[PDB]
């Protein structure tokens, strides 16, 4: 009597993830005339008006 | 942002055994042989990078 056996197994797993985000903003103002307190109030870069 | 995940696993087994018994004589005789083997292998490796 002769008995023989063979077994084999393999597992492969690869994972990849990429994330890229970009955002910019720019502002240019050019005001001529009446450089008093009110135009400094209007010189507020965040609010548009 | 960058993300990398790698995991590998390998499992292998082996089992074999030969049982041979033969006895020839004028008088009654008996020959018995028993052989059995077993192999088990497990491997695991995981990598994660962020």
Swiss-Prot record, chain A:
It is found in: Secreted; Target cell membrane. N-glycosylated; contains one or two bound glycans. Not O-glycosylated. It comes from the Eukaryota. The modification Phosphothreonine is found at residue 22. Heterotrimer of 3 chains: alpha (C8A), beta (C8B) and gamma (C8G); the alpha and gamma chains are disulfide bonded. Component of the membrane attack complex (MAC), composed of complement C5b, C6, C7, C8A, C8B, C8G and multiple copies of the pore-forming subunit C9. Belongs to the complement C6/C7/C8/C9 family. It is linked to Complement component 8 deficiency, 2: A rare defect of the complement classical pathway associated with susceptibility to severe recurrent infections, predominantly by Neisseria gonorrhoeae or Neisseria meningitidis. Component of the membrane attack complex (MAC), a multiprotein complex activated by the complement cascade, which inserts into a target cell membrane and forms a pore, leading to target cell membrane rupture and cell lysis. The MAC is initiated by proteolytic cleavage of C5 into complement C5b in response to the classical, alternative, lectin and GZMK complement pathways. The complement pathways consist in a cascade of proteins that leads to phagocytosis and breakdown of pathogens and signaling that strengthens the adaptive immune system. This is Complement component C8 beta chain. The lineage of its organism: Eukaryota, Metazoa, Chordata, Craniata, Vertebrata.
From Swiss-Prot, chain B:
It is found in: Secreted; Target cell membrane. It comes from the Eukaryota. The chain crosses the membrane at residues 16-24, 27-34. Component of the membrane attack complex (MAC), a multiprotein complex activated by the complement cascade, which inserts into a target cell membrane and forms a pore, leading to target cell membrane rupture and cell lysis. The MAC is initiated by proteolytic cleavage of C5 into complement C5b in response to the classical, alternative, lectin and GZMK complement pathways. The complement pathways consist in a cascade of proteins that leads to phagocytosis and breakdown of pathogens and signaling that strengthens the adaptive immune system. Heterotrimer of 3 chains: alpha (C8A), beta (C8B) and gamma (C8G); the alpha and gamma chains are disulfide bonded. Component of the membrane attack complex (MAC), composed of complement C5b, C6, C7, C8A, C8B, C8G and multiple copies of the pore-forming subunit C9. It is linked to Complement component 8 deficiency, 1: A rare defect of the complement classical pathway associated with susceptibility to severe recurrent infections, predominantly by Neisseria gonorrhoeae or Neisseria meningitidis. Belongs to the complement C6/C7/C8/C9 family. This is Complement component C8 alpha chain.
């Amino acid at each position: 009597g002769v008995s023989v056996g063979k077994c084999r197994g393999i597992l492969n797993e690869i994972k990849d993830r990429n994330k890229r985000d970009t955002m910019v903003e720019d502002l240019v103002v050019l005001v001529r005339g009446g450089a008093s307190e009110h135009i400094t109030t209007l010189a507020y870069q965040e609010l548009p008006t | 942002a960058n993300d990398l995940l790698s995991k590998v696993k390998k499992d292998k087994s082996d089992s074999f055994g030969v049982t041979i018994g033969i006895g020839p004589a004028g008088s009654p005789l008996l020959v018995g042989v028993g052989v059995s083997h077993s192999q088990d292998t497990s491997f695991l490796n995981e990598l994660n990078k962020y």
